[PDB]
Amino acid sequence: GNRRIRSVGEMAENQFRVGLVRVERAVKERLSLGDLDTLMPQDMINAKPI
Amino acid sequence: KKRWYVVQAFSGFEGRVATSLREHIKLHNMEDLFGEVMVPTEEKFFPGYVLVQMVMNDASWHLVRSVPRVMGFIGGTSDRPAPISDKEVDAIMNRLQQ
């Protein structure tokens, strides 16, 4: 009653979250310094960290 | 009177750090607290350091460390970081002039 099962659809949701955290730490800066006149979302993010 | 200080950037993005620093100055309009920004170049020393004419308030210190891709100042301590020297600024300007 104190120990719970984590199964694949939870461990992968966490490790996916690490990916979004490492996008967060980029896209914030690029959004701050960026002109927001040229940029479109596919310029903002990139898949490599996920 | 504005004295010099040394800033460390991610080595390779140094011109973009200098441009973003000038732009953060003209955003947060502390125009009376910054003189220049030097990246000297020979036909490139120093390899990753940005020279800033500045004064020391904690607001301007947070400004320069809130500029992106900047690690921090290089000095004796992180409370009151260190300016360099009169003759050292003069010699760097000498070799930049020469």
Binding site: - | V6, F45, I74, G75, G76, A82, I84, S85, E88
Partner: protein, 50 residues
């Protein structure tokens, strides 16, 4: 040594020596070009710490 062909499977020591030697190159530089205390107290610390 090679890994599966010429992919280098470095023995780790060559990364440690590479760390040292880079710092020692930079320290000979910033000494002979006569950096101030605050700069050599960077590289000298980084060297001892390597």
């Amino acid at each position: 040594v090679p890994l599966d062909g010429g992919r280098f499977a470095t023995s780790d020591l060559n990364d440690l020596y590479r760390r040292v030697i880079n710092r020692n190159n930079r320290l000979k530089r910033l000494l002979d070009l006569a950096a101030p205390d605050i700069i050599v107290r960077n590289e000298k610390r980084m060297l001892q710490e390597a």
